[PDB]
């Protein structure tokens, strides 16, 4: 899902998603993290 976690770049999200939600990967969509 998309979130409201602000980011400039994807490598910011990926570990945050893996840490928080336990998702496989994340990507910065339109300046906000999307985890999947």
Q: Report the number of distinct structural domains present in the chain.
A: 1
Experimental method: NMR
Half-sphere exposure of 17 (CA within 13 A, CB side): 23
Count of residues making up the chain = 36
Please list, in sequence order, all residues whose beta carbon lies within 8 angstroms of the beta carbon of residue 2, skipping any fewer than 6 positions away: 29, 32, 33, 34
Cα 18 to Cα 7, 11, 12, 15, distances in angstroms: 15, 11, 11, 5
| 12: CATH | 3.30.30.10
Domain range holding 24?
2-35
Name beta bridge partners: 19. Answer: none
């Amino acid at each position: 899902r998309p979130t409201d976690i602000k980011c400039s770049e994807s490598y910011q999200c990926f570990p945050v998603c893996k840490s928080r939600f336990g998702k496989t990967n994340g990507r910065c969509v339109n300046g906000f993290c999307d985890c999947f």
